[PDB]
RNA sequence: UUAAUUGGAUUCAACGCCGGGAACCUCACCGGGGGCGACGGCAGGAUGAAGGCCAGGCUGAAGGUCUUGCCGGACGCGCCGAGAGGAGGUGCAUGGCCGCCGUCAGCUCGUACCGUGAGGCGUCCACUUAAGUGUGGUAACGAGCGAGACCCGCGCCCCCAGUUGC
RNA sequence: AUGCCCCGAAACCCCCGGGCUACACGCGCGCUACAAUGGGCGGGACAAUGGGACCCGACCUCGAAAGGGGAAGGGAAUCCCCUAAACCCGCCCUCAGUUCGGAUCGCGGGCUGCAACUCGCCCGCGUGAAGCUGGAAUCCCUAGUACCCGCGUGUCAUCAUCGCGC
């Protein structure tokens, strides 16, 4: 199965964006931010940041 | 990260090397694609079912 | 394609199925398989030995039998029948798996020879071979003929009028390869 | 009436005319003027193969040979005569092709 | 000779033979890049994947590989028993199929007889034929496989059938 | 197919590229061929077996061509490849290593496929080699056979001076 990853941010109390959310698979899904590049692991696209 | 993918892409689509029989499974033997789809080694045994018949 | 091509393309399917068939029922004991052709539905009558394997034990083979003949035949609607075998004897396909079996044990060339050669020509034959190719359970190879009636003759004529059955049976040492030829009366 | 031939190409000697003069016996439910079996040629397949798997030295392969003879019946008649004839065709043995015209 | 020129065959019975298809394929052989192991068992499970992925940096192609940031839902690598697969080894271990000696006139049996026996006789002898084919003689009488006639075509005539024919 | 034994990121599995036709040679099997018994040019008389729907391709147009464009019919005694080739008559040539012979190669182009330097065929223009009747020695065949001429088919995208057949 597993071991090892995660990379969500935990907030308090609030809410926070980590990143952005993809446009193409609404809101759950969200954007590798590497300077103006868009990765996403759900189906697997390249994006620009829009 | 993960492991590589890997897919049959070879260009089998003319020539010998596109061909092969149901019978045997190969086409290393010299092949007859008219009318049926079998080898010369399954015409040795096949032959009269078709009703090819071995007599001149 | 053409009318003379149509011998071809449909008594090709009737091959696919014997090479099949014999091997997978030899749980009953296989013989032969009278298939009927018909644009209205292929109707294969298997001949086995012992009928319940053949139907299974709730359609458990029946199932299996459906959907093996669509993959090779261009009727869709297949239907099944078994008859029984009721000579084994008269038949070719049933004593080479009969002397099969023997051989399988260990039971030697000669004293299954009473069971396949003294009891075949009893139930009626013009003419009974048994032939076995093999090493004769040696080291090197060799054959042995035994012969009763007419079923070699002069000519095609009377050797290609037969009733003709080939098994395998296997050893741990080798394989010894398995000929039957009956020729019925006539 | 409809005309139509009634082309049969068989693989046996004796089933051709036995299946063109006793077809005029499946074909007649109504009445029918019917032409006598006209044969056209036999179309011959070869296909030759080497028996040998080696091939060495001297060899002799066969030849085979499959004749495939063909007769022609024109016969005029109701619809109610064809459909006698394609309806029941045999085990193949015997091929039947239906051509129809008026 | 070349990185390799893939292997077999190798006197008849190997050499336009498997190859009656030889640019990759084919292909076995060679060179470089990546990578799977079933089904049970074994520690592991949600502490997230076995799968996926921008962008340049690298591959003949594949986030494959790295820096780097990031998802969808959930069982299989690793091996150990033990299979699938191997155009993986051995055809002086084989089946099946084939070549040649040989489309040869040979090769066997039963009873009898002879001989301690292996065996002989018969299947020899004379005549005759492509043939152990046939005839007569004979301590032998008969039978089987092979070959002949049998099966298929080829020639001449008749009859049937007619869109071949005109 | 199959006894046995071995192999398990591998003698497995996937992929791209290569080679089997490399070459001073020798041997096996074929073909072309060495010219006036002739070739060219032109005309006229003649086929048979077969195969045929992303296939044979009528006929019509452009190209010397390879090929392309439009399009009829045909799943077959009924349409297409399809008129065979040898044959013969007249003229031209005037008998050379060439107007023989097609080797090798340049430039132009067609076709298939991811691609034809290594390993494709075909055309046009140029190129035009070796070869000028074969030593020792050796092979084939007995009648519609051999001597000799073309045609079709297979495998099949493509290599045919091959194989099967007429």
Avoid at chain 3, 1 to 15: H, S
Avoid at chain 3, 112 to 137: H, P
Wanted: charged share 30%; proline share 4%.
């Amino acid at each position: 199965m597993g071991q090892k990853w995660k990379l969500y941010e935990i907030k308090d109390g609030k809410v926070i964006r980590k990143n952005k959310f993809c446009p193409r698979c609404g809101p759950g899904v969200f954007m590798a931010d590497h300077g103006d590049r868009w990765a996403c692991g759900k189906c697997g696209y390249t994006e620009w940041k829009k | 990260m993960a492991k590589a993918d890997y897919n049959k892409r070879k260009p089998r689509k003319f020539g010998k090397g596109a061909r092969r029989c149901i019978r045997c499974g190969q086409y290393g033997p010299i092949i007859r694609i008219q009318g049926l789809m079998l080898c010369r080694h399954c015409f040795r045994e096949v032959a009269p079912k078709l009703g090819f018949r071995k007599y001149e | 394609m053409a009318i003379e091509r149509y011998f071809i393309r449909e008594a090709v399917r009737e091959m696919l199925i014997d090479e099949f068939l014999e091997k997978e029922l030899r749980r009953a004991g296989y013989g032969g398989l009278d298939i009927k052709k018909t644009p209205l539905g292929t109707k294969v009558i298997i001949f086995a030995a012992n009928p319940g394997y053949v139907i299974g034990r709730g359609g458990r083979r029946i199932r299996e039998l459906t959907r093996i003949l669509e993959k090779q035949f261009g009727l869709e609607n297949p239907q099944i029948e078994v008859e029984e075998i009721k000579n084994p004897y008269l038949n070719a396909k049933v004593q080479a798996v009969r002397l099969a079996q023997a051989l399988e044990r260990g039971i030697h060339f000669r004293r299954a020879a009473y069971a396949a050669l003294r009891a075949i020509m009893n139930n009626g034959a013009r003419g009974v071979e048994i032939r076995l190719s093999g090493k004769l359970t040696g080291e090197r190879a060799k054959s042995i003929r035994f012969y009763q009636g007419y079923l070699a003759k002069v000519g095609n004529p009377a050797e290609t009028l037969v009733s003709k059955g080939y098994a395998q049976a296997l050893l741990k040492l080798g394989v010894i390869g398995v000929k039957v030829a009956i020729m019925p009366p006539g | 009436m409809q005309k139509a031939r009634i082309k049969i190409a068989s693989t046996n000697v004796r089933s051709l005319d036995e299946v063109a003069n006793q077809i005029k016996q499946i074909a007649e439910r109504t009445g029918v003027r019917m032409s006598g079996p006209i044969p056209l040629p036999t179309k011959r397949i070869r296909i030759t193969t080497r028996k040998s798997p080696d091939g060495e030295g001297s060899a002799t392969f066969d030849r085979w040979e499959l004749r495939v003879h063909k007769r022609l019946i024109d016969i005029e008649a109701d619809e109610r005569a064809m459909r006698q004839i394609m309806r029941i065709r045999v085990p193949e043995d015997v091929t039947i092709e239906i051509e129809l015209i008026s």
